[PDB]
Design a protein around this nucleic acid. Structure first.
Ligand SMILES: [Mg+2]
Ligand SMILES: [Mg+2]
Ligand SMILES: [Mg+2]
Ligand SMILES: [Mg+2]
Ligand SMILES: [Mg+2]
Ligand SMILES: [Mg+2]
Ligand SMILES: [Mg+2]
Ligand SMILES: [Mg+2]
Ligand SMILES: [Mg+2]
Ligand SMILES: [Mg+2]
Ligand SMILES: [Mg+2]
Ligand SMILES: [Mg+2]
Ligand SMILES: [Mg+2]
Ligand SMILES: [Mg+2]
Ligand SMILES: [Mg+2]
Ligand SMILES: [Mg+2]
Ligand SMILES: [Mg+2]
Ligand SMILES: [Mg+2]
Ligand SMILES: [Mg+2]
Ligand SMILES: [Mg+2]
Ligand SMILES: [Mg+2]
Ligand SMILES: [Mg+2]
Ligand SMILES: [Mg+2]
Ligand SMILES: [Mg+2]
Ligand SMILES: [Mg+2]
Ligand SMILES: [Mg+2]
Ligand SMILES: [Mg+2]
Ligand SMILES: [Mg+2]
Ligand SMILES: [Mg+2]
Ligand SMILES: [Mg+2]
Ligand SMILES: [Mg+2]
Ligand SMILES: [Mg+2]
Ligand SMILES: [Mg+2]
Ligand SMILES: [Mg+2]
Ligand SMILES: [Mg+2]
Ligand SMILES: [Mg+2]
Ligand SMILES: [Mg+2]
Ligand SMILES: [Mg+2]
Ligand SMILES: [Mg+2]
Ligand SMILES: [Mg+2]
Ligand SMILES: [Mg+2]
Ligand SMILES: [Mg+2]
Ligand SMILES: [Mg+2]
Ligand SMILES: [Mg+2]
Ligand SMILES: [Mg+2]
Ligand SMILES: [Mg+2]
Ligand SMILES: [Mg+2]
Ligand SMILES: [Mg+2]
Ligand SMILES: [Mg+2]
Ligand SMILES: [Mg+2]
Ligand SMILES: [Mg+2]
Ligand SMILES: [Mg+2]
Ligand SMILES: [Mg+2]
Lengths: 271, 93, 46
RNA sequence: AGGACCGAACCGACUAAUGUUGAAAAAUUAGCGGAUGACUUGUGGCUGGGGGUGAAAGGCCAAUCAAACCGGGAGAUAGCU
RNA sequence: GCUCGCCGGAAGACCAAGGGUUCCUGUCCAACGUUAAUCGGGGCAGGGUGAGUCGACCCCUAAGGCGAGGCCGAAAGGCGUAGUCGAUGGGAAACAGGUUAAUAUUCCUGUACUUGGUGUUACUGCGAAGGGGGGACGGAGAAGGCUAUGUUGGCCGGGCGACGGUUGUCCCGGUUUAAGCGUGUAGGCUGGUUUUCCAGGCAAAUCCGGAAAAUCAAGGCUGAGGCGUGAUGACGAGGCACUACGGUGCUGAAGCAACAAAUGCCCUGCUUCCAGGAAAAGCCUCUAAGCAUCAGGUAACAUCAAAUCGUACCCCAAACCGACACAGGUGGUCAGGUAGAGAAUACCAAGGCGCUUGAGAGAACUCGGGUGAAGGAACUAGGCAAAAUGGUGCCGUAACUUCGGGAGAAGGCACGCUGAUAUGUAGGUGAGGUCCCUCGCGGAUGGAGCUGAAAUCAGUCGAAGAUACCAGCUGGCUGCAACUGUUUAUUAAAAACACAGCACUGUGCAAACACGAAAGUGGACGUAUACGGUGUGACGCCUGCCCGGUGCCGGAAGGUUAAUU
C-alpha cells in the first residue's frame, strides 16, 4: 500500500512509502545468495566513468532465474521477498523435484500459486512459453531477445510488453517506451505484468534517502568554472550558450543511437 | 640426530653476571652464550654431550647489540644469543 | 596540527621498498642510478 | 519513529581579546554549531599532472597548485635592470 | 623528612602504532639542559628482555595486487583465466600466588588445558580437487536475569586521645582468593522418531531437498550467573627479630551477610523497521574413483613433540608526528567516594605531580580579573564587549500554521533544616517456618531483616535555601534561502553548493555515455516504474505572447558539391 508519513520532522513531511505486508520478514534463502561489492562508478582503470555513484547500504545479490527453462515440472510459490538489487519483488518457488529458485514476481502472484514453463504450460500469469505458443495481443514480461539467452525486456516493476503481431519466424512487440520491435518467435516470455506497480508512487522525502541508495550529489554545470564544464563561468548567473554534456555534446534533442546491426529489428522508433 | 661437529660449534661461552650466579645458586640454571642459529634442541644436546649433565629444559633469548660511539665515529656491537639451561636438579655442573 | 608525515613501516616498505623498486622497469632504473652514484643506503628497506 | 530536541566525549570553527622576531609557519582563553547521522574514526587499498578528485571555493593533490615535485633539453630567451 | 599546593573520564594505569637502549647499576660534569647542578632521557663502563597456551610466523579469505597459458598493443607495455598473494576480519590451548636493581600469563610453587606423531589393545567400511550442513553477520528499541563494583551491618585486631567531652548508637584498619573440573539454572530456539518413494544437489550418496504414511507427544540444541571443588592451600591487619637502618627473616586473627548496581555478561538473543545487512577455511556429514581379512577409521592406555622470531623502556608523550626537553596532533582498554540526571561540574581515593631561572620592589603603561555613587546605549558603523537569564515540580501560554508545530512562547508560585503523619510511610528486596510435587539451581504460602522516595502539617535560622561549581535573555516587524547538511586546510560559512520534488532530452541492451591506440572495464550481474545529461529547486497558487535570429529535430523534389573516372 501507499502510506504518507506524518510531519513530525522536516525530513518526514514529504515522505511517501510503499509497504507490502505480504513480503517475507525473515532472511533470504541462503543457497541463492552471492556477494556484490560496490564500484563507486569506477572501472578497472580506477577512474570514475559514471558520475554520482557511491556509498549506500550493503547488498547481497540474489540469483534470479531469468531463463525459466525447467520445463514440464510444476512449481509452487512459497513466499514473496524483497530484493535490494531491483525494483520488482521476487518469489521463491519450489519445484516438485525439490529444487528452489527465485523468479520475478508477476502481478497478482501469491503464495500457494502454481506455475510452470514449457510449450504445454497453461496460459495464466507466471507461466513461461515460447512466444509462438502465446496468443497475439497477450501481455507478457521478462522477454527474451535471443532464444535461450534469458529474459531481458520488461523486467522492472510494473512493466510489460504486448505481442502485437506474428509473421512466421518473428513476432512484433510493443515495448514500454512505445518502440515496436521484432524478436524471434522462439524467444520465451512470461505471461502477465511485473508486480509492484506502486513502486513509482514512492517519494523519498529527503537527501539522505537518496544517499541510502548509493546516489551521490549532482553539481550543475552552470555552478562551475569554465575550466570544469562548458557551462561554467560568469559574473552572477549567466548562461548564454546551447546546453551540452560535460564533454561538449548537445544535450537537448540530439540523437545518439548509431547501431546498424540491429536497425533491421526496429519497426518504429519510440517517438 | 645432531652430528658432533655441530654440537662442538654451538656453545660459545658461559655468561658471567649477578643474575647468572643467582640463577645457578637458586634454580640450578646455567647461562651460556650460544650461536645465533642454535635451536633449543641443539643447545640441549650439546650440553648433554659436552658437559655430561642431563638437562631439563632450555630457554633462549636474542640480545641486541648496543650502538656505541668510538670517538665521534658511530659503531654497533653484534647481536648474540643467550640460553638459560635448567639442569635436572641433581647434576651440579 | 596533524602534520604530513605519519609513519607506518608497512606502507613505507610497500611503497618504496626494494621489492617495489624491483617490480617495474622504472624502479630498476632508480636502483641503477643510485648504484651508479654510489649510495650507501640503496632503498628505504635498509 | 525521527537527516526530532537539550547536552559531555567526539567532529567542527561563528564572535571577541591575546599573540603577530608567537608557546604555535594558523594556536590559546571565554563563549559558539552538529552531536543515531548526507555522522565520526582506525587499519589497508585504488584514482597521477592538461591528469586525478571536487555537496563547486579554481578548492585539494606531502607547510608547493589558473596546471605538483625531481632530473634533463639548459648556459632556453631577456631590444630590460 | 615534615608541612603546603595541583591532577584525579587524568596530569593515574595498560594496549596498538611509531621510536630503538631512552630501561637498571656504578661513575663523571667539559659540551648538552634556555640559570646553578652534587642532578639528567647528557658522557663513559657494566648489566638487563627466558613462552606448547600472549603476539607474529601458520591455515583461511575481503578490497586490491601479481598473474603460466591467453587476448591486445610501434617497442616499453595493458588487461585478464587457472592460480597465487593480501588483514583492518574467521581459525586449538593458562590461571592464581611468589620473586629481580632491571623480565615475567615467559622464571619458581600449586593447579590446568590443546593439537599432533608413534606404539599397544579392542571394535570397525575407509576414501575428494566433488555434494550438503555450518561458520555466517544490519539499524534501532525494550526489558528481565546477573556480575564487576560499592555501601552498611556482623566478625577480628588495635585505641580510650596535645583543648571542653569521648567504655560507646565511639575511633582506625582488615574482612581476599583464579583458571579448570562437576552441576545445566534465569532464559532463547526448535515437535521428535520409524518406514517407503523421487524429473533436484554437473556423477553417486545412507547426507541435504521434496512427497506419503505410522506413532509418540516429549526429545534435542544453546545458556549468563549461582552452588560444590580447586583451597586443611595461598594471601592476610598486625606483631616479634636482624638492619650493614635500603629493606630483609619469623609468625599470623577474622576472612561473613544484607542491600544497591552497570554503558559489562545472558544477547550472534528478543521485538520492530527498511535503506534489506562479507568471503573462505578450520568443523560436521555424504558418497565417487580406489582400497579391499591391507590401508584407513573410532576409543582407551603409554610415550614423544610443540620449532623460529618479538618480549627492556616511552606510549595525550621530554622517548611518536611538529627543526626545540615546542601551551599543537595521536587509535583502543580500565573507570573508586560524597553531591549530581551524568563519563558535566566541585572536593577527594588509588596513583602521580609543583610545569629547569630566581630574589626584591609595589611607578606609568600593557595583559587577565573583582567592585562601583547617580544615570542607564547618551557609546558605536553596529549593544562589539560586558552585564543579565539560567534548575526541578506544578499552574499558565497569542497571532499564525503545512495541524506536527509556534512552545521551555510569555508569565507565575514552591524550594534549607527539624519533628510528626509513619519510633522508616508507599514501594523494592526477601530469610526462617509451613504445605505440596514429575525431588530440584523445584512450586505455593510466609513475612523476620535490609533498603526506601514523594507529599502534607507544624516548628525554626539567615539579607538571601535551584545559596558554591554548573545552568536559556525575552518579545515585535521585515529581506533571503524551504528545511538537516556542504564550502574557499591558513582573512569570505553566506543569500553561494547540495537537497527531496519538477520538467526536458537521450538510451531497446553488445544501451546511451565514460576510461582506454586496443583488448577490455564501468553503466549493471541493471533492462524504459531503468540508466545518462541538462536546467529548476520543499509546499501553495501558477507558469502568458514570439520559431524572425542561433541551435536542434524531420524532409529530400530541385540547385551547388570530394575522392574516383
Ligand atoms: Mg546522474
Ligand atoms: Mg537532480
Ligand atoms: Mg562559482
Ligand atoms: Mg571550455
Ligand atoms: Mg547579471
Ligand atoms: Mg543576455
Ligand atoms: Mg619453561
Ligand atoms: Mg622467546
Ligand atoms: Mg538531531
Ligand atoms: Mg572544513
Ligand atoms: Mg572564518
Ligand atoms: Mg574553544
Ligand atoms: Mg539544532
Ligand atoms: Mg545538541
Ligand atoms: Mg571566481
Ligand atoms: Mg598544500
Ligand atoms: Mg602550462
Ligand atoms: Mg637548446
Ligand atoms: Mg640564464
Ligand atoms: Mg646512549
Ligand atoms: Mg634512568
Ligand atoms: Mg661547574
Ligand atoms: Mg649549564
Ligand atoms: Mg644516561
Ligand atoms: Mg582476487
Ligand atoms: Mg594483471
Ligand atoms: Mg605471459
Ligand atoms: Mg593464502
Ligand atoms: Mg588481523
Ligand atoms: Mg618494568
Ligand atoms: Mg556482588
Ligand atoms: Mg613490559
Ligand atoms: Mg621544560
Ligand atoms: Mg608537548
Ligand atoms: Mg582524535
Ligand atoms: Mg572533570
Ligand atoms: Mg600591579
Ligand atoms: Mg585592566
Ligand atoms: Mg564585574
Ligand atoms: Mg568589598
Ligand atoms: Mg555603576
Ligand atoms: Mg547603583
Ligand atoms: Mg532602567
Ligand atoms: Mg546613538
Ligand atoms: Mg555620538
Ligand atoms: Mg555579545
Ligand atoms: Mg558574562
Ligand atoms: Mg529592504
Ligand atoms: Mg539554507
Ligand atoms: Mg579561510
Ligand atoms: Mg559491457
Ligand atoms: Mg538555482
Ligand atoms: Mg515561459
Amino acid at each position: 500500500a501507499v502510506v504518507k508519513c506524518k510531519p513530525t520532522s522536516p525530513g518526514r513531511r514529504h515522505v511517501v512509502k510503499v509497504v507490502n505486508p505480504e513480503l517475507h520478514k525473515g532472511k533470504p534463502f541462503a543457497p541463492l545468495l552471492e556477494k556484490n561489492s560496490k564500484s563507486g562508478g569506477r572501472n578497472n582503470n580506477g577512474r570514475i566513468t559514471t558520475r554520482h555513484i557511491g556509498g549506500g547500504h550493503k547488498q547481497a545479490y540474489r540469483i534470479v532465474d531469468f531463463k525459466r527453462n525447467k520445463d514440464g515440472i510444476p512449481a509452487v510459490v512459497e513466499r514473496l521477498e524483497y530484493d535490494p538489487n531491483r525494483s520488482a519483488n521476487i518469489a521463491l518457488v519450489l519445484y516438485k523435484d525439490g529444487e528452489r529458485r527465485y523468479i520475478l514476481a508477476p502481478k497478482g502472484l501469491k503464495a500457494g500459486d502454481q506455475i510452470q514453463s514449457g510449450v504445454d504450460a497453461a496460459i495464466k500469469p507466471g507461466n513461461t512459453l515460447p512466444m509462438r505458443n502465446i496468443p497475439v495481443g497477450s501481455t507478457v514480461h521478462n522477454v527474451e531477445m535471443k532464444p535461450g539467452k534469458g529474459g531481458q525486456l520488461a523486467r522492472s516493476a510494473g512493466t510489460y510488453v504486448q505481442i502485437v503481431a506474428r509473421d512466421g519466424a518473428y513476432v512484433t512487440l510493443r515495448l514500454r517506451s512505445g518502440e515496436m520491435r521484432k524478436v524471434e518467435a522462439d524467444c520465451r516470455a512470461t505471461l502477465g505484468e511485473v508486480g509492484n506497480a506502486e513502486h513509482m508512487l514512492r517519494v523519498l522525502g529527503k537527501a539522505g534517502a537518496a544517499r541510502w541508495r548509493g546516489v551521490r550529489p549532482t553539481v550543475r554545470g552552470t555552478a562551475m568554472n569554465p575550466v570544469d564544464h562548458p557551462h561554467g563561468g560568469g559574473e552572477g548567473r549567466n548562461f548564454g550558450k546551447h546546453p551540452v554534456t560535460p564533454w561538449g555534446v548537445q544535450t537537448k534533442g540530439k540523437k545518439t543511437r548509431s547501431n546498424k546491426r540491429t536497425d533491421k529489428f526496429i519497426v518504429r522508433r519510440r517517438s | 640426530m645432531i652430528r658432533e661437529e655441530r654440537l662442538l660449534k654451538v656453545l660459545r661461552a658461559p655468561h658471567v653476571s649477578e643474575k647468572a650466579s643467582t640463577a645457578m645458586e637458586k634454580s640450578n640454571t646455567i647461562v651460556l652464550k650460544v650461536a645465533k642459529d642454535a635451536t633449543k634442541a641443539e643447545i640441549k644436546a650439546a650440553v648433554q654431550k659436552l658437559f655430561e649433565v642431563e638437562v631439563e629444559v632450555v630457554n633462549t633469548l636474542v640480545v641486541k647489540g648496543k650502538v656505541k660511539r668510538h670517538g665521534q665515529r658511530i659503531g654497533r656491537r653484534s647481536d648474540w644469543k643467550k640460553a638459560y639451561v635448567t639442569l635436572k636438579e641433581g647434576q651440579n655442573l | 596540527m596533524k602534520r604530513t608525515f605519519q609513519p607506518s613501516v608497512l606502507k613505507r616498505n610497500r611503497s618504496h621498498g626494494f621489492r617495489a623498486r624491483m617490480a617495474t622497469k622504472n624502479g630498476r632504473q632508480v636502483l641503477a642510478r643510485r648504484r651508479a652514484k654510489g649510495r650507501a643506503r640503496l632503498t628505504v628497506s635498509k
